[PDB]
Amino acid sequence: SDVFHLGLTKNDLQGAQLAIVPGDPERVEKIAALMDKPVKLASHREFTSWRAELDGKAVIVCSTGIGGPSTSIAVEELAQLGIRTFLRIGTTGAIQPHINVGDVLVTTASVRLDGASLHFAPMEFPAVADFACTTALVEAAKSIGATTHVGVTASSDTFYPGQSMEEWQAMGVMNYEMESATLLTMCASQGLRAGMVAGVIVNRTQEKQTESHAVKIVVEAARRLL
Amino acid sequence: SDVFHLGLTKNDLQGAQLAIVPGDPERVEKIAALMDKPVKLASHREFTSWRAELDGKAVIVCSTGIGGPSTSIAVEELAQLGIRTFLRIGTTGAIQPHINVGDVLVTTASVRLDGASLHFAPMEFPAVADFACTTALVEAAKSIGATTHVGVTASSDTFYPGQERYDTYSGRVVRRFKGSMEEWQAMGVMNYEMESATLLTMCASQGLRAGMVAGVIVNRTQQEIPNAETMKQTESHAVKIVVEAARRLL
Amino acid sequence: SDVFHLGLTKNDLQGAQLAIVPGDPERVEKIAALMDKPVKLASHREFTSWRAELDGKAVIVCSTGIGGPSTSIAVEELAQLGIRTFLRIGTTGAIQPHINVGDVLVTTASVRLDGASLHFAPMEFPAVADFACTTALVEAAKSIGATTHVGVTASSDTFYPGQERYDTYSGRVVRRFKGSMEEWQAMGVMNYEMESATLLTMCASQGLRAGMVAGVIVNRTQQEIPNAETMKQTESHAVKIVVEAARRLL
Amino acid sequence: SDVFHLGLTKNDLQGAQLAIVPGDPERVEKIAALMDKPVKLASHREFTSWRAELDGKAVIVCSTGIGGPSTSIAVEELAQLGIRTFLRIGTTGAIQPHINVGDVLVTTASVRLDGASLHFAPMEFPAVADFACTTALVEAAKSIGATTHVGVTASSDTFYPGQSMEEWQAMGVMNYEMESATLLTMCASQGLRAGMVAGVIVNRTQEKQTESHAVKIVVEAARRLL
Amino acid sequence: SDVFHLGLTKNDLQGAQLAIVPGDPERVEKIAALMDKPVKLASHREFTSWRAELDGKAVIVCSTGIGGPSTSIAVEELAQLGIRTFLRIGTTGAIQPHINVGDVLVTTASVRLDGASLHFAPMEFPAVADFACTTALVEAAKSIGATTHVGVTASSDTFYPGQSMEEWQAMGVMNYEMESATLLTMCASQGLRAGMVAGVIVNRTQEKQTESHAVKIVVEAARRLL
Amino acid sequence: SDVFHLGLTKNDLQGAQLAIVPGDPERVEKIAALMDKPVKLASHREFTSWRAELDGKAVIVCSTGIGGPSTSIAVEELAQLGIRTFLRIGTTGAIQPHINVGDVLVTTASVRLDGASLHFAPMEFPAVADFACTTALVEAAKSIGATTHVGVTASSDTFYPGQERYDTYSGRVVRRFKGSMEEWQAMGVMNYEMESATLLTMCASQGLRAGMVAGVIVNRTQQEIPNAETMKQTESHAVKIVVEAARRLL
C-alpha cells in the first residue's frame, strides 16, 4: 500500500480528485450505491473505502471513524493519494428552536472545541469551509427541495459536549458534532477544499429518510465540484 | 442622537437595514454617489455617515475608522439603529505571489489576530462571513469581470509587527509573530487587514449578516511596484462590486 | 443493550471487572484466545468485544478504535458496565535510538497532546498510569525475558503533524510542533501513540486503574528497517505480557 | 510622505523628539494652542498632527484615534520620524470611591486587557510607564495645585469593559480606558519613553475645566522632558 | 565551590549518585543521622547539605527550601555534581476521607499548579515519578508495616492553595504540597530519577512519630536504589 | 507568635510599618546595623528578622529566602503584622552590556516569569513598583553618587532555564525560554532575579507599597570578570541606598 493506514494505492483511485468522507462504513456503502460503477476497495480498522464514478469521473468514498484524530488520518492519506476536495456528510441534532427534524445544515465554519485542529493551525485560524463546496451543497440541497440552514457548527472531542451549550445557542450555533473542526481546519490551512452537510435527526424543539436525502445532497454536490 | 458616537437618530436611517462600511471617511461619499439620492447624514471623528437609496430602499454608508475597537463601536451603534447586514469594502495588500494588483479578494473567514473580537466570542468561534453576503459579493465581482480570490484573511491589531514588518523603528518582531507571515502564506491566507476579525465575529455571533470585499492595490511579495494608479481603478472597481452586492441583499 | 455504542448489556460481562483494550478490532480475538473460554460478545463499528476467563474470573477484551474520542467512548461505556481496571496493549514505534525493535515499553505517564483528556481533567493533571497496573506489566515483561523500557509516552491527536512527520501532502508542520520531536527526545520520551492521554487521564481522575504496554515494531530514528516479522513475534509477546499482567490484577 | 499613514516627513518635525498623543483632533488643537508657534501639519484619517515649540524646541501633537490598533500606528510612525518620548493625556471615569471628579490620574502601569500590546511583548511583560515621564507628570500636576493619584489603569479594547470590574476595584485599579496598555507596552519594550495622565470627569462616587487642566499638565510635563 | 549556591565541590560528594532532598535543615540532620558516617558539608541560605553512607556508598542529604524555585536550584546543582537520583520526603495533610494521620503517601505524579515546572517542560508533559524510585518507596514502606497510599499529589506555589480543592478531591488527589511538581517534572524531563513520599500529619477527616517513619522509609528506599 | 512562619508577634515590631526585605538572612544584621538600636527579633528557616529605629520610628529588616513562594510567605506575614511599605534590596547580575559592575538598578516593574504572583493577580496585571518607593530609591541613589539605571527587571521562578543558562547538567532549555534572553535584552530588560514579580504584584494589588533596588555585582554579557570585591563595595552601597530611601518613606 502507498499509505500507512487506508490500504490503498494511487492506482486504486483511478485519477479521483474528490472524496466523500462520512463517519461509518454503513454510510459509505449507501453513498457509493448512489453513484456509477461502485467498487469496494479496502477495509482496515475505521477506514472502509469505495471507488465510484460521477459523470465519468472517479470519486472516492471513505469512512473516517469517530473524532478529529481518526478523521485526520483518513484525510491526509487520501490527500497523499491525490484527493484535493473533501465533502463530509453526517446526521446530527440541532440546538436552535427554528430548526426542524428533516432540515439540512450546511456548515460555513466550525467552533474549534477539538484537539486535532490545533495540530494544523493555531486557534486564531478559522475552521472555515471552502466557498465552492459550500455553494455546491446549498445548490444541491435546493435542487431536491430540502429546507436548508447555512451557518456555524460546534465541534468537540466528547460525545457528551463541554469541557456552555446555551452559550453556543445564543451565538447562533446550529448544531454539534465531532469531526468538522478538524476536517475544515486541516483542509483550509493546507490548500484542500472541504465542505460539510448534515441532516437533522433530533432537536429541542422542532413540523433514515433524513439520512437518505443528506446522502443524495452530498453526492449531487460532488457532481458539481468535479 | 440615539447613539453615543455616530451622532445619528434612528429616523436618519429612514428604515435602512443594510450598511456599507469602509474604513476611511474619505471614501464614504464616493460610495454613496454610486446610488440614488446621496445625502450626508453626519460626521464625527472618523465616523462619516451618508444615506442613499438603492432600488427604492434606504442604504447607509458609514466609516469604521482603523482597528477593531473603533470598528466595534461603529458596528454596534449601527446595529442599534437597525442595521442587520454589513458589507465591508477596503483596499488591501496581498501576501500571495499569484495574487495581482487589481485583483479582488472576498473573505470567507479571518484569522483572529486582534483583541476586540474576544469580547464577542471566545477564540474557538470562527470569524466567519455570512453565506448570502459572500455569495452576493462573489457574484457581483464576476459580473464586472474582476479576477477574484475567495478565502481566508489575517486580521491584525497592528499594522507593523502583527503583519511581520521589520522596516520599523526597532526592527524587532516579538516571538509570537516571528516567522508568522511565512506560516500564513503556507496556509493559503490571502492578505492582512485590521478590522474584519471584529466585524465578522460580532456579526456572526449576534444574528447579523456580514461580508467583506477588498481590491488589491499592492503586493509586498512582488518586486514590481503598483502602477501610478496604485489605487484608483482598483478602488473604483471594489466600490462598484460592493454596491452591486448590496443590491442583491436588499 | 445497556450502552450507546458497544452493544453490550451488563450481564454479557458476567461480572468482569478487568478489560484489556487494544486499538484494533482485528487483535481482539487473538488476545481472548490466550485465555479460557474465548467467546465473542459483540461487534459494532471498531468496537469488537470478547469475553474470556482467567483463573476462574471473567475478563473482557474490547477494541477502542483510533484516537481519544473513540477511546473515551469505549472506556466510559466499559466503566458503565462495571470495568474498573483497563490494560492498554499496542504496538508502537520508538523515538529513542537505543530502543530496539522487539523491545517492550511500559508507560508511567503520557504527554497530553490531545483534546479528549481535557474533558476529564484540566491540563495540569497528570496522564498517569495506576501503580499496580504498571507494576503488573513490568513484572509480566520481566517474566518472559523481554527487554523493557519504563517511562513517558507522547500521546497525540494526530498521526502526522503531532508526531512531526514531514513526509505528507503539505510537507508543513504547524509552529507548535516544529522541532517538537527533538524536544521530546531530549526529555526522554519513549514513543508516540494516540490514545493513552485520554485513557490514563480519564481513569486516574475517576477512581479507575489503567496501565499501558506496547511492543516496539519500528524505530524511525534507526536506519535499519524492521525484520520481515516487522510485527508478529513482537505483537505476540506484547499480548502474552498483557494477559499475564491481567492475571496479577484479578 | 516618509511614513505610511501620518502624511509627514522627517523635515516636518524640525528636530522634534517628543510627541503628545491624545485620542482626538479637537484635543490636539487645544494642546497645541498652549505652546509656542503652533502649526497644523497634516490630517489623514484618525491622525491629525501639529507642530509647536516649548523652550525653543519642537514638539509634535498627534491624535491616535480609538484603541490600541490605531494608537500603535501613530506611535510607530512618529518613532520612525525621530520621536523618542510620548505623553498621552485623556479624560476618564474613576472606579475608586476616594477619587474625585477633577482629580488627575498619573498611570504607573496598565492592566493589559487589550490585543495590540501582545504584538509587542508577551503577557508577562509589564505595561509600565517610563520613570522620567511619570515623574514629570506628577511634578507638573503638583505645580498647578492639582489633586493627584498615581497608580494602575485598566486598559481594554471595548467601550463596554469586560471579556470583573469589582475585581479591578479590589485590586486598587484607578480607572479604565483603551489605549494605555498598548502605548506603554510598545514603548517600554522598544526603548521609547512614555507617560500617561488623565483628568477625572465621572465616578461612582466622588467634593471642560478638568480636560483643560489635564491638558496644561501634559504640556508642562513635556517641557520638563526636553 | 563548583556550584553557584550550595557551596559544594564534586570531591565533597565522594562519588555519591543519590540525594535525599527534604525542605528544611532540621529534617536533613534527622535523615543523615539514620545513615552511616554522617558529615555536615555546608550551609548556605536555604541549602544545608550532609554526606553519609548506605551499604558503603556515599549519599547526600540536602534541604531545598520552600517552593519549586529554591528546589530547582538545589536539584540542578546537585545534578551538576553527579547526583542522578533524587528522593523527596515531606509531611503533609491529606484531602481524602479514607486517608489516616500516620499513613504514608507515595506520589506517582503531581498536578502541576506551580510556576517552576513550566521552566523545564510545557504543561502537557506529566510531572511523573520514576518507576524504580516509586517502587523502592512502596517496598520500604511495606517493610516497616506502614499503611500506604499510592497516587496523585497537587503541587502549587501558595501556602494557601488556589489561584477548587473539592475539584481535586473528586479527582482522587491525595494531598497538597509545593515542591513535587517542580522536582518530578525537572527530573523526568532531564534523565534524572525522582521519587516522593510524605507522612500524613493532618486530615478532615481520618483511627514527630509520623515524620520519623517517613524519614526511615526514604532512607530504606535510598538503600534499594544504590 | 502571631504568624505561622516568622515567629513574630505584633508587639515585636513596636508599631513598625516599613520593612526592608533582603533575600539572604546573612545580610539582615548588616542592614539593621546602619540604623539605630539594632535588635535581633527572631530567626526561623531563612526568615531572620531584626528591628531597628530610623529617625525615631521602628523599622523591620527581614529576609525572604529564595523565590516567590518563600517571598509570598514573608510578605503576607509581615503585612499581617502591620507592614505597609516593603523595600527589596538585592545584588544582581545584569544582561545589558552598558550596565557596569558597581552600578545600581531601581526596578519600575517586572516581567512575571514566575507562578506565585498569579495567586494574587491575573497575568494581565502589572508587577509594578509603588511610585513613592521608586522615587525614594532613585533619589537615595543619586544622593550617594551611584550610577543608576531605572527600568524593567525579569523575575524568574528558576535560576537556570528561566534565565536561559546552558551551562547546566542537561544543557537544554525548554522551548518557552530558548532565545528568551536575547528578546528581553532587545526589550530593554536590565537584569534577572527571582522574587520581585511576587513581591510587586502582591503589594500593588493589596494596597501596599513596594520598591526594589539592587547593586550589580556581575554582568554575564561582559568579558571582564568582577573585581576581587565582586560584591562588597557594591553590596555596601546598595544597603546604604535602601536605608536612605526608607528614611524618606517613614
Side-chain angles (χ1 to χ4, degrees), chain A residues 1-205 207-226, chain B, chain C, chain D residues 1-205 207-226, chain E residues 1-205 207-226, chain F:
Chain A
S1 168
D2 282 343
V3 293
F4 284 122
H5 297 81
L6 303 187
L8 295 169
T9 69
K10 185 164 186 189
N11 175 71
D12 283 326
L13 269 62
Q14 298 185 1
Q17 289 193 114
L18 183 148
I20 300 169
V21 285
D24 65 289
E26 290 73 27
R27 190 161 279 161
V28 169
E29 190 162 347
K30 301 176 206 293
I31 297 161
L34 293 193
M35 291 177 289
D36 294 332
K37 315 186 204 175
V39 172
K40 186 167 178 178
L41 297 178
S43 187
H44 302 280
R45 311 196 60 177
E46 276 93 339
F47 311 114
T48 301
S49 48
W50 288 57
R51 183 181 65 231
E53 288 183 28
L54 286 176
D55 294 353
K57 297 181 186 171
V59 167
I60 294 298
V61 192
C62 185
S63 55
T64 59
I66 297 167
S70 197
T71 298
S72 75
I73 293 172
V75 177
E76 168 59 29
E77 290 183 14
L78 286 165
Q80 285 185 21
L81 298 167
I83 303 294
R84 301 286 177 264
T85 301
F86 293 86
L87 301 176
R88 176 160 181 97
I89 179 273
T91 44
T92 66
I95 63 170
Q96 294 299 335
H98 65 268
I99 295 175
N100 299 323
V101 177
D103 288 359
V104 165
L105 313 178
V106 174
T107 299
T108 53
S110 300
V111 189
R112 296 179 51 190
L113 308 171
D114 63 320
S117 65
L118 290 161
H119 291 219
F120 299 96
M123 189 68 76
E124 295 93 339
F125 187 99
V128 66
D130 175 77
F131 179 72
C133 298
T134 300
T135 293
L137 291 159
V138 171
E139 292 174 344
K142 181 179 311 183
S143 84
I144 67 163
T147 297
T148 305
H149 302 274
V150 187
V152 176
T153 290
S155 201
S156 68
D157 290 321
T158 41
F159 201 78
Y160 68 91
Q163 270 140 218
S164 193
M165 188 165 51
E166 268 56 75
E167 185 185 47
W168 303 131
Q169 182 179 358
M171 288 171 176
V173 173
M174 299 185 304
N175 68 314
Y176 258 101
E177 48 78 75
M178 293 171 294
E179 294 80 21
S180 71
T182 298
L183 171 69
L184 298 187
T185 306
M186 78 182 288
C187 290
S189 63
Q190 295 189 112
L192 300 166
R193 303 192 303 180
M196 164 92 187
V197 65
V200 176
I201 59 174
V202 62
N203 179 10
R204 344 264 155 123
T205 339
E207 316 98 27
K208 49 79 65 180
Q209 165 80 169
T210 296
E211 182 193 24
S212 278
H213 299 336
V215 165
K216 176 61 166 168
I217 292 169
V218 78
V219 169
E220 292 313 311
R223 200 185 305 274
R224 298 168 181 267
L225 289 165
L226 302 163
Chain B
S1 65
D2 293 335
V3 294
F4 277 80
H5 300 262
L6 304 186
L8 304 179
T9 68
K10 196 170 190 187
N11 186 252
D12 297 349
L13 272 66
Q14 303 284 330
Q17 293 180 311
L18 181 149
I20 300 177
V21 291
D24 188 344
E26 264 276 329
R27 195 158 64 195
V28 177
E29 182 186 342
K30 271 292 200 301
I31 294 166
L34 287 201
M35 302 179 285
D36 302 332
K37 316 192 308 176
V39 172
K40 177 168 181 174
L41 299 179
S43 195
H44 299 94
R45 286 290 223 115
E46 288 304 284
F47 307 119
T48 290
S49 53
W50 282 58
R51 200 194 57 247
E53 182 171 304
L54 202 57
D55 291 336
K57 292 205 183 300
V59 171
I60 292 298
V61 194
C62 182
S63 44
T64 61
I66 291 162
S70 187
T71 297
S72 71
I73 287 168
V75 172
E76 78 184 340
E77 293 194 7
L78 285 172
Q80 292 171 196
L81 294 174
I83 300 300
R84 295 173 183 173
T85 298
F86 293 83
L87 298 177
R88 168 71 166 187
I89 180 272
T91 55
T92 188
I95 62 174
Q96 294 291 345
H98 78 279
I99 296 187
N100 297 315
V101 169
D103 284 1
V104 167
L105 310 183
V106 175
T107 297
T108 55
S110 295
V111 187
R112 296 171 58 185
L113 305 175
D114 73 321
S117 63
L118 287 163
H119 293 73
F120 302 94
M123 190 61 77
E124 290 83 3
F125 190 95
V128 67
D130 172 76
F131 179 77
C133 291
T134 303
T135 295
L137 290 159
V138 173
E139 295 181 352
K142 169 200 194 73
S143 83
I144 73 152
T147 294
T148 306
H149 307 278
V150 182
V152 176
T153 291
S155 194
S156 165
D157 258 358
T158 61
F159 184 83
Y160 291 98
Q163 302 189 21
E164 203 180 0
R165 292 189 139 92
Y166 290 97
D167 295 336
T168 55
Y169 170 66
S170 73
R172 160 179 90 76
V173 167
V174 73
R175 167 181 309 218
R176 166 170 180 200
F177 290 109
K178 301 175 165 287
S180 62
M181 190 177 61
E182 170 177 345
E183 295 161 343
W184 307 134
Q185 290 169 311
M187 297 181 184
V189 174
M190 303 186 294
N191 65 310
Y192 287 111
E193 51 78 68
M194 304 184 56
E195 291 80 23
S196 74
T198 292
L199 170 67
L200 299 181
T201 303
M202 64 189 297
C203 288
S205 64
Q206 289 175 188
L208 309 167
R209 299 187 310 175
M212 172 165 68
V213 66
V216 180
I217 62 168
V218 65
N219 187 337
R220 65 199 270 202
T221 78
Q222 296 176 344
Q223 185 166 22
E224 180 172 0
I225 68 179
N227 311 277
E229 311 272 1
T230 158
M231 316 201 298
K232 265 328 298 162
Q233 180 225 47
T234 297
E235 296 212 20
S236 296
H237 295 326
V239 171
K240 186 188 282 202
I241 292 169
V242 81
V243 169
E244 287 311 310
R247 190 185 302 275
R248 303 159 184 256
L249 294 160
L250 289 176
Chain C
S1 65
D2 293 335
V3 294
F4 277 80
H5 300 262
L6 304 186
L8 304 179
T9 68
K10 196 170 190 187
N11 186 252
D12 297 349
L13 272 66
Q14 303 284 330
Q17 293 180 311
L18 181 149
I20 300 177
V21 291
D24 188 344
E26 264 276 329
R27 195 158 64 195
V28 177
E29 182 186 342
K30 271 292 200 301
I31 294 166
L34 287 201
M35 302 179 285
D36 302 332
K37 316 192 308 176
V39 172
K40 177 168 181 174
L41 299 179
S43 195
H44 299 94
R45 286 290 223 115
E46 288 304 284
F47 307 119
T48 290
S49 53
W50 282 58
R51 200 194 57 247
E53 182 171 304
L54 202 57
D55 291 336
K57 292 205 183 300
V59 171
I60 292 298
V61 194
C62 182
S63 44
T64 61
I66 291 162
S70 187
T71 297
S72 71
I73 287 168
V75 172
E76 78 184 340
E77 293 194 7
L78 285 172
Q80 292 171 196
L81 294 174
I83 300 300
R84 295 173 183 173
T85 298
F86 293 83
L87 298 177
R88 168 71 166 187
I89 180 272
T91 55
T92 188
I95 62 174
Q96 294 291 345
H98 78 279
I99 296 187
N100 297 315
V101 169
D103 284 1
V104 167
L105 310 183
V106 175
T107 297
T108 55
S110 295
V111 187
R112 296 171 58 185
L113 305 175
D114 73 321
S117 63
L118 287 163
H119 293 73
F120 302 94
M123 190 61 77
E124 290 83 3
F125 190 95
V128 67
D130 172 76
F131 179 77
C133 291
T134 303
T135 295
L137 290 159
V138 173
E139 295 181 352
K142 169 200 194 73
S143 83
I144 73 152
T147 294
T148 306
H149 307 278
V150 182
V152 176
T153 291
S155 194
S156 165
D157 258 358
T158 61
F159 184 83
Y160 291 98
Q163 302 189 21
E164 203 180 0
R165 292 189 139 92
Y166 290 97
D167 295 336
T168 55
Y169 170 66
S170 73
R172 160 179 90 76
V173 167
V174 73
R175 167 181 309 218
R176 166 170 180 200
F177 290 109
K178 301 175 165 287
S180 62
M181 190 177 61
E182 170 177 345
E183 295 161 343
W184 307 134
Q185 290 169 311
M187 297 181 184
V189 174
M190 303 186 294
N191 65 310
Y192 287 111
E193 51 78 68
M194 304 184 56
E195 291 80 23
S196 74
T198 292
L199 170 67
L200 299 181
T201 303
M202 64 189 297
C203 288
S205 64
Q206 289 175 188
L208 309 167
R209 299 187 310 175
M212 172 165 68
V213 66
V216 180
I217 62 168
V218 65
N219 187 337
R220 65 199 270 202
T221 78
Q222 296 176 344
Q223 185 166 22
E224 180 172 0
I225 68 179
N227 311 277
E229 311 272 1
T230 158
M231 316 201 298
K232 265 328 298 162
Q233 180 225 47
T234 297
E235 296 212 20
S236 296
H237 295 326
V239 171
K240 186 188 282 202
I241 292 169
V242 81
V243 169
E244 287 311 310
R247 190 185 302 275
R248 303 159 184 256
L249 294 160
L250 289 176
Chain D
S1 168
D2 282 343
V3 293
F4 284 122
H5 297 81
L6 303 187
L8 295 169
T9 69
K10 185 164 186 189
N11 175 71
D12 283 326
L13 269 62
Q14 298 185 1
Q17 289 193 114
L18 183 148
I20 300 169
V21 285
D24 65 289
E26 290 73 27
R27 190 161 279 161
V28 169
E29 190 162 347
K30 301 176 206 293
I31 297 161
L34 293 193
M35 291 177 289
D36 294 332
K37 314 186 204 175
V39 172
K40 186 167 178 178
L41 297 178
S43 187
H44 302 280
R45 310 196 60 177
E46 276 93 339
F47 311 114
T48 301
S49 48
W50 288 57
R51 183 181 65 231
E53 288 183 28
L54 286 176
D55 294 353
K57 297 181 186 171
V59 167
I60 294 298
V61 192
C62 185
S63 55
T64 59
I66 297 167
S70 197
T71 298
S72 75
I73 293 172
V75 177
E76 168 59 29
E77 290 183 14
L78 286 165
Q80 285 185 21
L81 298 167
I83 303 294
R84 301 286 177 264
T85 301
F86 293 86
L87 301 176
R88 176 160 181 97
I89 179 273
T91 44
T92 66
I95 63 170
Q96 294 299 335
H98 65 268
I99 295 175
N100 299 323
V101 177
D103 288 359
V104 165
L105 313 178
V106 174
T107 299
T108 53
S110 300
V111 189
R112 296 179 51 190
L113 308 171
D114 63 320
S117 65
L118 290 161
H119 291 219
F120 299 96
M123 189 68 76
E124 295 93 339
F125 187 99
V128 66
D130 175 77
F131 179 72
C133 298
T134 300
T135 293
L137 291 159
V138 171
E139 292 174 344
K142 181 179 311 183
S143 84
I144 67 163
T147 297
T148 305
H149 302 274
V150 187
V152 176
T153 290
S155 201
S156 68
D157 290 321
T158 41
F159 201 78
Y160 68 91
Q163 270 140 218
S164 193
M165 188 165 51
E166 268 56 75
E167 185 185 47
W168 303 131
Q169 182 179 358
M171 288 171 176
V173 173
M174 299 185 304
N175 68 314
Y176 258 101
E177 48 78 75
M178 293 171 294
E179 294 80 21
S180 71
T182 298
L183 171 69
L184 298 187
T185 306
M186 78 182 288
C187 290
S189 63
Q190 295 189 112
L192 300 166
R193 303 192 303 180
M196 164 92 187
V197 65
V200 176
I201 59 174
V202 62
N203 179 10
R204 344 264 155 123
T205 339
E207 316 98 27
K208 49 79 65 180
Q209 165 80 169
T210 296
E211 182 193 24
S212 278
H213 299 336
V215 165
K216 176 61 166 168
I217 292 169
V218 78
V219 169
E220 292 313 311
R223 200 185 305 274
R224 298 168 181 267
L225 289 165
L226 302 163
Chain E
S1 168
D2 282 343
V3 293
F4 284 122
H5 297 81
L6 303 187
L8 295 169
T9 69
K10 185 164 186 189
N11 175 71
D12 283 326
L13 269 62
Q14 298 185 1
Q17 289 193 114
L18 183 148
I20 300 169
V21 285
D24 65 289
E26 290 73 27
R27 190 161 279 161
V28 169
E29 190 162 347
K30 301 176 206 293
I31 297 161
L34 293 193
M35 291 177 289
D36 294 332
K37 315 186 204 175
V39 172
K40 186 167 178 178
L41 297 178
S43 187
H44 302 280
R45 311 196 60 177
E46 276 93 339
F47 311 114
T48 301
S49 48
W50 288 57
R51 183 181 65 231
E53 288 183 28
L54 286 176
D55 294 353
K57 297 181 186 171
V59 167
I60 294 298
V61 192
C62 185
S63 55
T64 59
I66 297 167
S70 197
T71 298
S72 75
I73 293 172
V75 177
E76 168 59 29
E77 290 183 14
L78 286 165
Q80 285 185 21
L81 298 167
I83 303 294
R84 301 286 177 264
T85 301
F86 293 86
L87 301 176
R88 176 160 181 97
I89 179 273
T91 44
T92 66
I95 63 170
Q96 294 299 335
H98 65 268
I99 295 175
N100 299 323
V101 177
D103 288 359
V104 165
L105 313 178
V106 174
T107 299
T108 53
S110 300
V111 189
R112 296 179 51 190
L113 308 171
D114 63 320
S117 65
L118 290 161
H119 291 219
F120 299 96
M123 189 68 76
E124 295 93 339
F125 187 99
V128 66
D130 175 77
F131 179 72
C133 298
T134 300
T135 293
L137 291 159
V138 171
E139 292 174 344
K142 181 179 311 183
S143 84
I144 67 163
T147 297
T148 305
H149 302 274
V150 187
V152 176
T153 290
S155 201
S156 68
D157 290 321
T158 41
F159 201 78
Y160 68 91
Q163 270 140 218
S164 193
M165 188 165 51
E166 268 56 75
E167 185 185 47
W168 303 131
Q169 182 179 358
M171 288 171 176
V173 173
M174 299 185 304
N175 68 314
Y176 258 101
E177 48 78 75
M178 293 171 294
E179 294 80 21
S180 71
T182 298
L183 171 69
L184 298 187
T185 306
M186 78 182 288
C187 290
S189 63
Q190 295 189 112
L192 300 166
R193 303 192 303 180
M196 164 92 187
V197 65
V200 176
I201 59 174
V202 62
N203 179 10
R204 344 264 155 123
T205 339
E207 316 98 27
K208 49 79 65 180
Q209 165 80 169
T210 296
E211 182 193 24
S212 278
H213 299 336
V215 165
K216 176 61 166 168
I217 292 169
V218 78
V219 169
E220 292 313 311
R223 200 185 305 274
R224 298 168 181 267
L225 289 165
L226 302 163
Chain F
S1 65
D2 293 335
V3 294
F4 277 80
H5 300 262
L6 304 186
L8 304 179
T9 68
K10 196 170 190 187
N11 186 252
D12 297 349
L13 272 66
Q14 303 284 330
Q17 293 180 311
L18 181 149
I20 300 177
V21 291
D24 188 344
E26 264 276 329
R27 195 158 64 195
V28 177
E29 182 186 342
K30 271 292 200 301
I31 294 166
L34 287 201
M35 302 179 285
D36 302 332
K37 316 192 308 176
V39 172
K40 177 168 181 174
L41 299 179
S43 195
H44 299 94
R45 286 290 223 115
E46 288 304 284
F47 307 119
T48 290
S49 53
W50 282 58
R51 200 194 57 247
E53 182 171 304
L54 202 57
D55 291 336
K57 292 205 183 300
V59 171
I60 292 298
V61 194
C62 182
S63 44
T64 61
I66 291 162
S70 187
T71 297
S72 71
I73 287 168
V75 172
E76 78 184 340
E77 293 194 7
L78 285 172
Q80 292 171 196
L81 294 174
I83 300 300
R84 295 173 183 173
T85 298
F86 293 83
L87 298 177
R88 168 71 166 187
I89 180 272
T91 55
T92 188
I95 62 174
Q96 294 291 345
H98 78 279
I99 296 187
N100 297 315
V101 169
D103 284 1
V104 167
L105 310 183
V106 175
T107 297
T108 55
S110 295
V111 187
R112 296 171 58 185
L113 305 175
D114 73 321
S117 63
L118 287 163
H119 293 73
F120 302 94
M123 190 61 77
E124 290 83 3
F125 190 95
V128 67
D130 172 76
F131 179 77
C133 291
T134 303
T135 295
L137 290 159
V138 173
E139 295 181 352
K142 169 200 194 73
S143 83
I144 73 152
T147 294
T148 306
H149 307 278
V150 182
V152 176
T153 291
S155 194
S156 165
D157 258 358
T158 61
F159 184 83
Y160 291 98
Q163 302 189 21
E164 203 180 0
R165 292 189 139 92
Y166 290 97
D167 295 336
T168 55
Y169 170 66
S170 73
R172 160 179 90 76
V173 167
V174 73
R175 167 181 309 218
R176 166 170 180 200
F177 290 109
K178 301 175 165 287
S180 62
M181 190 177 61
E182 170 177 345
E183 295 161 343
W184 307 134
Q185 290 169 311
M187 297 181 184
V189 174
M190 303 186 294
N191 65 310
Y192 287 111
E193 51 78 68
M194 304 184 56
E195 291 80 23
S196 74
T198 292
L199 170 67
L200 299 181
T201 303
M202 64 189 297
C203 288
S205 64
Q206 289 175 188
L208 309 167
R209 299 187 310 175
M212 172 165 68
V213 66
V216 180
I217 62 168
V218 65
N219 187 337
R220 65 199 270 202
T221 78
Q222 296 176 344
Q223 185 166 22
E224 180 172 0
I225 68 179
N227 311 277
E229 311 272 1
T230 158
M231 316 201 298
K232 265 328 298 162
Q233 180 225 47
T234 297
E235 296 212 20
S236 296
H237 295 326
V239 171
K240 186 188 282 202
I241 292 169
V242 81
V243 169
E244 287 311 310
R247 190 185 302 275
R248 303 159 184 256
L249 294 160
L250 289 176

